[PDB]
Chains A and B, each alone.
Chain A
Amino acid sequence: QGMFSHQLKRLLQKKSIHRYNWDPLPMYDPRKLVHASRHMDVETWREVPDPHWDERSYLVPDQMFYNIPVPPEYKDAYWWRELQARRVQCPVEWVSHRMYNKGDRQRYDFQDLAFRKKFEFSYEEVVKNAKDMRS
């Protein structure tokens, strides 16, 4: 009944900043794996640079690190993180209008829950192409 509660109702009704934090991988560390499957030059006791290893490197995503190269042998333990990185990075309920309306059902890529719009010719380019084809 007090002004404190009167304010609190709407103050708590307020929304809060949201961020999609990927689940960590305490047991599996791509940063630690970076050194896996590497030869060691003994004259300096240091990892030997390996262009073949770099080419084979499977790039695991991460929010703190833009990429993490891991040898393709152990990539199978990061499948869930790959889906999390590929998805829309927000609750679907916030973008489900794309699924609901027909135009976006054809104009958006819904693979792995992504909601990134596909390429779409502008009206000027559409008219140019039609006129070039004479139709």
Chain B
Amino acid sequence: TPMMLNIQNMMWWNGKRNLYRATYREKTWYEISRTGAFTKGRRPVMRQKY
């Protein structure tokens, strides 16, 4: 398995890509990782001020 072997298969690097990944990723791993922008740590959640 390429991921197990730690093979750097990237389209801009060698023109290859692993077949077990998803073609479209809505938000990258960094976007998923950043939790302060996802949870209610300090950010306000309802911008409407009635």
What separation, in Å, do the CA atoms of A110 and B25 have in the docked complex?
9
* Closest chain B CB from A14 CB (angstroms): 20
Verify if A33 is at the interface (C-beta below 8 Å from B).
no
What DSSP secondary structure best describes chain A's contact surface? helix
What DSSP secondary structure best describes chain B's contact surface? loop
State the total of A-B contacts with C-beta under 8 angstroms: 12
* Closest chain A CB from B27 CB (angstroms): 9
Verify if A113 is at the interface (C-beta below 8 Å from B).
yes
What is the size category of the interface that chain B forms with chain A? under 10
B12's closest neighbor in chain A, by CB?
Answer: A100
B27's closest neighbor in chain A, by CB?
Answer: A105
Interface string of A75-106 (1 = CB under 8 A from B): 00000000000000000110010010000000
* Closest chain B CB from A17 CB (angstroms): 23
Which of B11, B24, B25, B26 is within 8 Å of A113, CB to CB?
B24
Chain B residues within an 8 Å CB radius of A110: 24, 26
> B2-50: which residues lie under 8 A (CB-CB) from chain A?
11, 23-26
A contacts, CB < 8 Å to B: 92-93, 96, 99, 110, 113
* Besides A96-B23, A110-B24, 9 other A-B contacts (C-beta < 8 A): A92-B24, A93-B11, A96-B11, A99-B23, A99-B24, A99-B25, A110-B26, A113-B23, A113-B24
